[PDB]
Structure formats: C-alpha cells, structure tokens
Ligand SMILES: CC(C)[C@@H]1NC(=O)C[C@H](O)[C@H](Cc2ccccc2)NC(=O)OCCCCCCCCCCCNC1=O
C-alpha cells in the first residue's frame with residue numbers, strides 16, 4: 001500500500017437531498033487537476049507525486065461491466081495493469097487541465113446520425129455511470145435507437161430490443177471507439193422488475209466549463225483508461241472482454 | 242512499485258474502494274472520481290439533519306494520533322448532489338490495510 005502524509009480533506013457535516021443516503025460508498029476521492037479543487041486543497045494524487053510515493057505519475061482504471069463479476073474493478077496507482085487490457089494503449093492530449101478534458105472528433109450512430117459533427121470537448125469521468133452529452137443531441141441519439149424518456153435526461157429501451165440496436169462509435173485522436181448496444185445499455189432493478197437504461201444521459205453544462213460530453217463508466221468499462229500527469233494525456237486500450 | 246486498489250461494482254452504477262484516514266487507519270469506501278479534485282468523508286460531528294451520515298462510516302479525529310486541525314469551512318457542488326463541512330489533515334492510506 002501507500003501512506004500519503006499531511007493530506008487535507010473534508011469532514012462532511014451536511015449532505016442535503018437524497019443522493020448520498022442510499023449510496024454504497026462513504027465518500028469521494030477526487031483525482032482531477034488542482035485547478036478544480038474546492039478551497040484550492042492539494043489533491044491526494046498531487047500529494048502522492050510530491051512525496052514521490054510512485055515512480056510513474058500515472059493511474060489506471062479497469063471497471064467490470066458484469067455487475068456480479070469479481071473483482072468489480074481496479075485502480076492502479078503508479079502503473080497500468082496488463083491483466084485487464086488487450087493490446088496497446090492509444091493516447092490523446094489533455095486540452096484543458098482541470099477536468100481530464102480531451103478533444104472528441106465525433107459521435108456516430110451506425111444507422112447514420114452523427115453528433116459532435118465538427119468536433120467538441122469531452123471529459124473522462126470515472127465518477128459518472130453514464131455517457132453524458134448535450135440535451136438536444138442526446139434527444140436525437142435516443143430517437144435513432146428507439147429509447148424513450150424516463151426522467152431528468154435519462155431514457156429507457158425495451159430489453160427485448162437491445163440486441164438489434166445499432167452500434168455507436170466515438171472518434172478520439174482519429175481512432176474509432178465502438179460501443180455495442182450491450183456496452184451502452186445497463187440493466188437496472190427495482191422491486192423485482194428489470195429494465196434496460198440507455199447509457200447516454202442528456203445534460204447541458206453551461207459555459208465557461210461547458211458544453212461538454214462525458215465519457216463515463218459505460219466507456220471506461222469497454223476501454224481500460226490511463227490518466228497520465230507526467231505527460232498530461234489520457235490512454236485507452238480495449239479492456240479484457 | 243505500482244499500488245493496486247481493488248474496487249467493488251454495484252449494479253454497473255457505483256465503483257468504490259477502501260481507503261484509510263488516520264493513525265491507526267479508520268476505513269472508508271470512496272469513489273475515485275476523475276471528475277473532481279477533493280477528498281471527503283462523513284464526520285462524527287455531522288449534523289443530526291444529515292440522514293446519509295446515520296448509515297455511513299464517520300471519521301473521528303480524536304482517535305487519530307496524526308490528525309492536525311484545520312477547521313476551514315467547505316461547500317462542494319457536484320452534478321448530482323452537494324455537501325458541506327470543515328477541513329482537517331491526516332494520513333490517507335490506500336488501500337486501508
Ligand atoms: C469539480 C466538482 C466540484 C464537480 N464534479 C462533478 O460534479 C463530476 C463528478 O464526477 C461527480 C462525482 C459524484 C459521484 C457520486 C456522487 C456524487 C458525485 N459526478 C456527478 O455529479 O455525476 C453526475 C453527472 C456528471 C456531471 C458533472 C459536471 C456538471 C457540473 C456540476 C457543477 C460543477 N461541479 C463539478 O464539476
């Protein structure tokens with residue numbers, strides 16, 4: 001393990017609303033750049049680097065996409081883990097060092113709809129489950145695949161329809177990153193029922209930060225991801241499948 | 242060498258692993274979140290209004306020999322949810338043990 005000394009952190013005393021009540025986790029450990037740290041608190045990974053607790057200042061995520069699989073995932077601090085990807089890593093430069101922000105060349109539904117047609121900005125976010133894009137573009141996307149609105153920018157798809165949906169490909173650094181319908185849809189359960197959630201959510205992030213697409217756990221699940229602070233870049237390889 | 246931190250997966254929607262805060266370490270589960278830059282966990286001093294705190298692990302600074310007080314107030318707003326509290330300083334272990 002590692003011991004990061006003299007780390008400044010929040011002791012939470014108020015959590016209004018419901019989002020943290022039924023969450024499985026106690027807290028959040030942020031791993032983006034110092035620029036977006038509230039109170040300018042030096043982040044954990046930044047402290048770890050300053051204390052030279054790893055040799056390579058990179059970290060990597062494997063996320064399992066079978067909800068019952070063991071292990072559920074792995075974060076590797078200071079390295080990548082070959083157990084969880086096939087082939088070589090392909091890299092993109094970070095554009096704005098705040099979030100882990102990169103240039104997205106386009107998003108294409110196989111049946112022909114193209115979003116982000118002339119390129120746009122995206123962030124790579126382990127802390128959101130779904131892909132996120134602008135409300136209007138996501139609406140078009142969901143219409144193309146036959147999903148229907150649920151609530152707050154989320155959409156559902158009849159489970160028996162999933163296997164015949166078109167693939168959706170994100171173009172990053174000139175390479176295509178395909179998501180099958182199985183990759184971009186999620187099983188959800190409540191009270192003994194099963195439904196299929198569309199893995200794209202519509203949400204408008206205002207300037208100056210936005211607009212932004214978000215590559216969430218849907219993407220990172222298919223594509224093992226490396227976050228590299230030495231070279232300010234993000235790397236993707238096909239995850240173990 | 243590189244440090245592995247195994248994660249749990251709940252319903253393909255929440256991924257989280259165990260860390261330690263303090264000496265000796267008090268264990269907490271956290272999302273390792275590449276869309277933010279702060280660490281926080283619930284305090285033993287959380288308000289009685291904070292229902293989430295009732296059923297999550299709580300940090301007790303009195304039990305940590307490496308704790309250093311800060312006390313500055315913080316508020317964080319995410320896309321889903323908000324919280325506030327105060328800052329503290331301690332040793333963070335990954336994994337917890
Ligand atoms: C920098 C932070 C103050 C904050 N970051 C986030 O909101 C993104 C983060 O990944 C959270 C993590 C999370 C996980 C579980 C429970 C709660 C929080 N994901 C989160 O909130 O996921 C929901 C959808 C993603 C949208 C995030 C960006 C929109 C801007 C929000 C206002 C500025 N704040 C933010 O951008």
Ligand SMILES: *[C@@H]1O[C@H](CO)[C@@H](O[C@@H]2O[C@H](CO)[C@@H](O)[C@H](O)[C@H]2NC(C)=O)[C@H](O)[C@H]1NC(C)=O
Pocket residue numbers: 008039040041042310311312313328
């Ligand atoms: C609360 O912690 C912050 C850091 O998160 C302290 O501010 C830092 O203190 C050192 C030494 O005074 C400086 O070298 C840093 O540049 C400061 N950084 C920032 C961003 O403020 C702050 O002093 C602490 N406050 C209290 C009251 O303990």
Ligand SMILES: *[C@@H]1O[C@H](CO)[C@@H](O)[C@H](O)[C@H]1NC(C)=O
Pocket residue numbers: 093231
């Ligand atoms: C990516 O960043 C590095 C370091 O800043 C730079 O040398 C290189 O030219 C950049 N690559 C591209 C494709 O812009």
